[PDB]
């Protein structure tokens, strides 16, 4: 039903499963490895991405869930400027 | 640690990514805790300055592959009045490791082999097993 | 003899572009040797009325950034004769853009290009971000995709 | 018709989506699903504001103009202790470095 996802400052984020799984690179993290996956005991570790880039990438995974596939008008996804580079490299490593 | 190319030690790296490596061809235990660190292993190793170890990542898997194959190859060569059945075994086995291979290799898969004969890491696995049965196909005689 | 250009099918179609999107939408019609022509652009609320023909080709692009852009849901619009009269709708709407691709038009859209290297990003980005969106390249790829 | 939200306390946030119609009793209801904690242990606020079991969330003041997938709003959450009351505290998230030059 839900993932965890964690910060590299300590920051919880918890979203639906099948919204992360948006990220090629997390549906690889849980695809792993690939046995016991249902121990009840699902998270995942960025060591490398900050809270104020982790909270903008699950809000991607929402609007991604929402308008793809949605006949309503789409709206553009806001980035701030200085979010920019962060959000590119964690974009990239997420693979979404 | 950050996103952004760090200045990174191989083989302090390629050390503890071949142990999980060889787990996971094999289809032993990974804990998801450490695969998840292999994958962020596997990012650092393709960012890196001087020069990026992708290739280099690259090329040791390449050699750990032929090493398995051929081991393989011996393993099965041990008759046990049982080819195909320990070739069977092995196939099944070796596949679902190329998988998950293909899977925790993902980065170098879709942002380094756009570079380019260099194939996937899953299709190359696949590779190496086509000279284990290249060899058997010759010696049907 | 190209593969996506228009045919000239002297067959009107009545069509009416509706700009569902915050782009100012630039229009692009395949003539019959495949060479993309511009039309006036559109704003953000706005409709406007076309003559075509049938199996004439249309693509449609961010004016200021040449960003793809959908049609009815894809890549190329194509008039059909029209039913009852009832005048063929292209539905220009944004698309859901992948992150990366998203940031990496937010990043072109600040940094002048001659400066992308000067950025603190993976190397590797510096291609992609070079690799600005371009009709010619779709083109390309569509008449790939076209024939296989 | 839905409302986008980013449930948080103490460094810990839960983004879930829900309907303008839908009471705040619900959305306990939700987060008992998630963290394992009844809604008789719940204090949801909006802007230090104490949210009612029975109001709807259109009520509350929350709108799909607002709340939205991309941008959603942010609902306060505190725990009721040992006899007591906690007092709420939402851990602010990190901050992007100084706008480099080739930016400006």
Same mark, same amino acid.
């Given at each position: 039903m839900y993932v965890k996802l964690i910060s590299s400052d300590g920051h919880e984020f918890i979203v639906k499963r099948e919204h992360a799984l948006t990220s090629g690179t997390i549906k690889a993290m849980l695809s792993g490895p690939g046995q016991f996956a249902e121990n009840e005991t699902n998270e995942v570790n960025f060591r490398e991405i900050p809270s104020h880039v982790l909270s903008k990438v699950c809000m991607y995974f929402t609007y991604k869930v929402r308008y793809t596939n949605s006949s309503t008008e789409i709206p553009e996804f806001p980035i701030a400027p200085e979010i920019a580079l962060e959000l590119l490299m964690a974009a990239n490593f997420l693979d979404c | 640690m950050s996103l952004?190319?760090?200045?990174?030690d191989f083989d302090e790296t390629w050390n503890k990514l071949l142990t999980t490596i060889k787990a996971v061809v094999m289809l032993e235990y990974v804990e998801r805790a450490t695969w998840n660190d292999r994958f962020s292993?596997?990012?650092?190793?393709?960012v890196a300055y001087p020069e990026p170890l992708g290739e280099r990542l690259y090329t040791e898997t390449k050699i750990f592959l032929e090493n398995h194959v051929r081991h393989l190859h011996k393993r099965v060569?041990?008759?046990?009045?049982q080819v195909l059945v320990m070739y069977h075994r092995y196939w099944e086995?070796?596949?679902?490791?190329?998988?998950?291979?293909?899977?925790?290799? *993902?980065?170098?898969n879709t942002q380094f082999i756009k570079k380019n004969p260099l194939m996937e890491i899953g299709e190359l696995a696949l590779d190496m097993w086509r000279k284990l049965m290249v060899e058997?196909?010759?010696?049907?005689? | 003899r190209p593969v996506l250009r228009s045919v000239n099918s002297r067959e009107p179609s009545q069509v009416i572009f509706c700009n569902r999107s915050p782009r100012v939408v630039l229009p692009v019609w395949l003539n019959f040797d495949g060479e993309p022509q511009p039309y006036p652009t559109l704003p953000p609320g706005t409709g406007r009325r076309i003559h075509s023909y049938r199996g004439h080709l249309w693509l449609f692009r961010d004016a200021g950034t040449h960003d793809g852009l959908l049609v009815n849901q894809t890549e190329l619009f194509v008039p059909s004769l029209n039913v009852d009269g009832q005048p063929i709708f292209a539905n220009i709407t944004l698309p859901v853009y992948t992150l990366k691709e998203r940031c990496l038009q937010v990043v072109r859209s600040l940094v002048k290009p001659e400066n992308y290297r000067r950025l603190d990003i993976v *190397?590797?980005?510096?291609?992609?971000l070079e690799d600005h969106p371009?009709?010619?390249?779709?083109?390309? *790829?569509?008449?790939?995709?076209?024939?296989? | 018709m839905d409302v986008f939200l980013m449930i948080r306390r103490h460094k810990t946030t839960i983004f879930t989506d829900a309907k303008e119609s839908s009471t705040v009793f619900e959305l306990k209801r939700i987060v008992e699903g998630i963290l394992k904690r009844p809604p008789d242990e719940q204090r949801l606020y909006k802007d230090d504001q104490l949210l009612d079991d029975g109001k709807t969330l259109g009520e509350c003041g929350f709108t799909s103009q607002t709340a939205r997938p991309q941008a959603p709003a942010t609902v306060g959450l505190a725990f009721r202790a040992d006899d007591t009351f906690e007092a709420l505290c939402i851990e602010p998230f990190?901050?992007?470095?100084?706008?480099?030059?080739?930016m400006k």
């Open positions: - | 952004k190319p760090r200045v990174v292993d596997i990012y650092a190793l393709c060569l041990e008759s046990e009045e086995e070796y596949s679902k490791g190329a998988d998950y291979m293909d899977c925790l290799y *993902r980065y170098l058997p196909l010759q010696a049907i005689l | *190397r590797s980005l510096y291609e992609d371009n009709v010619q390249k779709d083109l390309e *790829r569509l008449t790939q995709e076209r024939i296989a | 990190s901050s992007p470095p100084e706008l480099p030059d080739v």
